[PDB]
Design a protein around this ligand. Structure first.
Ligand SMILES: [Ca+2]
Lengths: 114, 114
């Protein structure tokens, strides 16, 4: 089911480089919006998208925690991320799936769960 | 595709009352956990869930913005919310289904889109 979450970033261009080019989420839109540059990405195969925003000051840049996105191969994702210079915690098993966390340039933590 | 977001609340019992009874989300879990009480809800038929947490310092209670969840009937949701005393911003028209926003007791802003 469709869901959209707003990730607080300090520099939208650097965030685009990270999420689209480094992590490999697909770019869905990069166009003017009501509050600023509307920059929207989503994992391939997913119906959950992230908007990389800078206009919600109650959410300081890099403050996001506690987000998990489904993946079909968390070990593959982690190997690719570490190869590309990204900090990764995990993978680790839980009763609810096999999960890992990584941080974006501002410190937002993105979780992946298989 | 599965996704999980953490919503920062202050009074977890009040938040449970709000998300489960006022808004009408399903209760998926309510049990003691590693970082605190694990309280998890989700819209009916959704694969996106919300965990109502109080343990992320970078996410103060009520600070969350920019979250949008699918609904099949935004007008019905708004009618139920207003019957229960919740102010609703909207609903207002969009290129594919109308949307609406409202605040939880802490001030987190939740969006629904048809
Ligand atoms: Ca989803």
């Amino acid at each position: 089911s469709n869901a959209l979450f707003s990730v607080p970033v300090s520099d939208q261009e650097k965030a685009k480089d990270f999420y689209v080019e480094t992590v490999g989420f697909d770019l869905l839109a990069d166009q003017p919006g009501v509050h600023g540059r509307w920059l929207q990405v989503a994992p391939k195969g997913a119906d959950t998208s992230l908007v990389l925003v800078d206009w919600f000051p109650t959410m300081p840049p890099g403050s996001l925690r506690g987000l998990l996105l489904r993946t079909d191969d968390v070990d593959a994702d982690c190997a690719r991320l570490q190869e590309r210079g990204v900090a990764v915690d995990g993978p680790k098993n839980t009763p609810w799936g096999r999960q890992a966390m990584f941080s974006d340039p501002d410190g937002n933590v993105i979780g992946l769960n298989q």
